[PDB]
Amino acid sequence: MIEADYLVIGAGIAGASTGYWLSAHGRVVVLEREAQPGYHSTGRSAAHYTVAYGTPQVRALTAASRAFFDNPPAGFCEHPLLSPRPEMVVDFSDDPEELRRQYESGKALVPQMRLLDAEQACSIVPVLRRDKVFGATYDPTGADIDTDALHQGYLRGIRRNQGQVLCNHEALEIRRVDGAWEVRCDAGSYRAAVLVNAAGAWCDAIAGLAGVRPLGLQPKRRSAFIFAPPPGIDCHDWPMLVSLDESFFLKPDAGMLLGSPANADPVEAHDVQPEQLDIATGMYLIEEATTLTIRRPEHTWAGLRSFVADGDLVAGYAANAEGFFWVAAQGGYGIQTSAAMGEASAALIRHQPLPAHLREHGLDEAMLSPRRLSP
Ligand SMILES: Cc1cc2c(cc1C)N(C(=O)/C=C/CNC(=N)N)c1c([nH]c(=O)[nH]c1=O)N2C[C@H](O)[C@H](O)[C@H](O)COP(=O)(O)OP(=O)(O)OC[C@H]1O[C@@H](n2cnc3c(N)ncnc32)[C@H](O)[C@@H]1O
């Protein structure tokens, strides 16, 4: 039996970021089912940072994370966590009212957002089919995230603060015993006053083991693939390209191109595989919008983006289940919100107010709380 101050289930970006901030204040033990910590959604993302994306709460958490990403503590990482990658959202269907709505809402949050005409969009990504382009928004502040450096920075930080990150430690039974949570794994048992449920698509499964009413979390499959660009064109500086209805996205990645149909097909929590239909649809949509020819993709995969009803993230104690803390519903935003989520969740776990720099971005405890959800 191992005793901790904070017992975290899940070592993805959610558990790693929360554990990182908690580890300055007490003993953190993170239990991870897989042999490695980033095998599920945290290892499967498009690795992009976009402020004007998601609900208002998501946008606030994303904006509030930028300070840490651009200036992490000494020793956190060897190289920058972000690299410049503007986002261009292109209207391919002739919907000027929607284009203007997105421009105005994005510009209110990102003053440098621009409205482009068709020629300006085609200048930036020359493979766009000019006949299909009706304008675009352009966000000069988008960035690519070095997700492995970020994730490993969080995990190493836990260990440097005398915490533990224990892989091959699936939580199998969870019980509140004598004022603390006790978790049984095949490889040992663990006890702590606080159980941090950071289990990704499995958060409601963890609540089920504990007898705690679940959130209603819905995992949703998104597939993606990498393909070769034509050898005679330099796409390495292209922005992240998205269609106005998020029917697809396309971004450069290590001399290749990363594409996706940006799907959200509801599925159960599992080790999700790409569906051939997902890949075919993404290929079709990119070829409809651009002059690219996509041969058989070099690599395809899928991951889970998990949401509650309102599309917002969840960080808070469960009502009437003392010490059970949700860090859940990261949706399509878990990487880009992770610094603010980790800092906010650690403060709330410790029953402290949210730090000033988070409240100034317009975050409060209530809009993170799970109590907002079910009747
Ligand atoms: C698939 C995917 C996902 C994303 C994306 C793409 C694709 C293709 N991107 C986008 O399309 C962006 C579109 C932009 N579009 C417009 N601009 N217009 C994206 C992104 N996000 C982000 O910011 N930027 C991105 O660019 N996403 C989302 C992030 O992928 C996601 O939100 C976080 O990764 C979630 O992280 P979590 O930490 O919640 O989840 P987890 O990594 O699965 O970890 C849980 C751990 O619990 C363990 N576990 C379970 N049960 C137990 C147990 N019993 N015992 C012990 N351990 C247990 C489990 O084994 C696992 O290890």
UniProtKB/Swiss-Prot annotation:
Belongs to the FAD-dependent glycerol-3-phosphate dehydrogenase family. This is FAD-dependent catabolic D-arginine dehydrogenase DauA. Its cofactor is FAD. The record marks 87 as: Important for specificity toward positively charged substrates. In vitro, it is essential to include phenazine methosulfate (PMS) or iodonitrotetrazolium chloride (INT) as the artificial electron acceptor in the reaction to ensure DauA remains active with FAD. GO terms for cellular component: cytoplasm. Pfam families: DAO. It catalyses: D-arginine + A + H2O = 5-guanidino-2-oxopentanoate + AH2 + NH4(+); a D-alpha-amino acid + A + H2O = a 2-oxocarboxylate + AH2 + NH4(+). Inhibited by D-arginine and D-lysine at high concentration. DauA is highly expressed within the cystic fibrosis (CF) lung, and it is required for virulence via the optimal production of hydrogen cyanide, pyocyanine, pyoverdine, rhamnolipid and alginate during biofilm formation. Involved in the catabolism of D-lysine and D-arginine. Under aerobic conditions, the arginine succinyltransferase (AST) and arginine transaminase (ATA) pathways are 2 major routes for L-arginine utilization as the sole source of carbon and nitrogen. The D-to-L racemization of arginine by DauA and DauB is necessary, before to be channeled into the AST and/or ATA pathways. Keywords: FAD, Flavoprotein, Nucleotide-binding, Oxidoreductase, Virulence. Induction: Induced by growth on D-arginine, D-lysine and 2-ketoarginine (2-KA), but not on L-arginine. Repressed by DauR. ArgR could be a transcriptional activator of the dauBAR operon in response to the presence of L-Arg. Optimum pH is 8.7. FAD binds at residues 14, 32-33, 41-48, 171, 331-336. Monomer. It is an enzyme of class 1 (oxidoreductase). Disruption phenotype: Cells lacking this gene are unable to grow on D-arginine or D-lysine as sole nitrogen source. PANTHER family: FAD-DEPENDENT OXIDOREDUCTASE DOMAIN-CONTAINING PROTEIN 1, SARCOSINE DEHYDROGENASE-RELATED. GO terms for biological process: arginine catabolic process; arginine metabolic process. One of its GO terms (molecular function) is D-amino-acid dehydrogenase activity. It comes from Pseudomonas aeruginosa (strain ATCC 15692 / DSM 22644 / CIP 104116 / JCM 14847 / LMG 12228 / 1C / PRS 101 / PAO1). Its EC number is 1.4.99.6. Optimum temperature is 37 degrees Celsius.
